[PDB]
């Protein structure tokens, strides 16, 4: 039901964070930012006047001409809250750039927006094993210990007992499996 | 002719050629402390007792050196030269073993002549490989 989510994850690497540190020290290069005016940047007082004029002077209509590109934009997430969010997103796209009629190109970017804003082995084996020791337990509970034991029992992908603890917590809390007792483990 | 060259003495001369590097001259082979790090890196990849490529070793070399930041991660080409320093002393041998996908294709499987008992003595003296174990 949320209209817009935002993955604001960093994913640290080179030739990015270097520009981040350079831009944070570029205003530390001079003691006063008097040199902030020679760039493509609107002032705040002009921006709020343009925004206040556009919010109270434009009532854009969503025509039927942008029907065809909306249907297919919905089925890609379907293969009604997203549709209600994207029509408000498209009319806000129409709210900017002084437009009274919505246009076909304006929803393209809108969808790109919601597609760029959002961009298993572990638990699987976990459950798998849980099932196993259940079966071999005559369905009785798997122990914390035996769990950890068989699960590190394989050298391949290193399931650390802490990670174990975590994913376990996940499934149980995900309600898939039930575990009880501080000192014991239940399948 | 040795007593002519000097103008079971020789069996004593010939067995020390064969017995050493495991007890003593292992550290002779690894004057580089990174060569000590890369030697433990091979054995950590030997958990998956597989065709120990120079890449799967390089896989475990990067994914451990990003966790413990003992040094910067080096090149694969550097990783090629450093394991050959391990080679010429006679510790690890490299052979072009078998994989049969397209043709008889040669990936390189290594094998070490050291044991964990002769490993654990020479690493407790250096607590920088102690993060890595």
Curated annotation (Swiss-Prot), chain A:
Cellular compartments annotated: Nucleus
Function description: Acts as a component of the MCM2-7 complex (MCM complex) which is the putative replicative helicase essential for 'once per cell cycle' DNA replication initiation and elongation in eukaryotic cells. The active ATPase sites in the MCM2-7 ring are formed through the interaction surfaces of two neighboring subunits such that a critical structure of a conserved arginine finger motif is provided in trans relative to the ATP-binding site of the Walker A box of the adjacent subunit. The six ATPase active sites, however, are likely to contribute differentially to the complex helicase activity.
This chain belongs to the protein called DNA replication licensing factor MCM4
Q: Where is this motif: Arginine finger?
A: 1-3
Q: Which gene encodes it?
A: MCM4
Annotated family? Belongs to the MCM family.
* Subunit composition and interactions: Component of the MCM2-7 complex. The complex forms a toroidal hexameric ring with the proposed subunit order MCM2-MCM6-MCM4-MCM7-MCM3-MCM5; loaded onto DNA, forms a head-head double hexamer.
Superkingdom field = Eukaryota
Name its species: Saccharomyces cerevisiae (strain ATCC 204508 / S288c) (Baker's yeast)
Q: What else is known?
A: Present with 8800 molecules/cell in log phase SD medium.
From Swiss-Prot, chain B:
Q: Which region is the signal sequence?
A: none
Tell me, using the record's free text, what induces this protein: Transcribed at the end of mitosis, but in cells with a prolonged G1 phase there is a second burst of transcription in late G1.
The places in or outside the cell where this protein is found are: Nucleus; Chromosome
Q: PTM details?
A: Ubiquitinated by the E3 ubiquitin ligase complex SCF(CDC4), DIA2, and TOM1; and targeted to the 26S proteasome for degradation.
Annotated coiled-coil positions are none
Record's subunit section: Associates with the ORC complex and the MCM2-7 helicase complex. Interacts with CDC4, CDC28, DIA2, ORC1, and TOM1.
Q: Which family does it belong to?
A: Belongs to the CDC6/cdc18 family.
Reported function: Plays a crucial role in forming the pre-replicative complexes. Interacts with the origin recognition complex (ORC) and MCM2-7 helicase complex leading to the linking of those complexes and loading of the replicative helicase MCM2-7 onto the pre-replicative complexes. Required for the initiation of DNA replication and then actively participates in the suppression of nuclear division.
Instruction: Identify this protein by name.
Output: Cell division control protein 6
Q: Which organism is it from?
A: Saccharomyces cerevisiae (strain ATCC 204508 / S288c)
The taxonomic lineage of its organism, from the top, reads: Eukaryota, Fungi, Dikarya, Ascomycota, Saccharomycotina
Gene responsible for this protein: CDC6
Q: Intact protein stretch covered?
A: 343 to 512 of 513
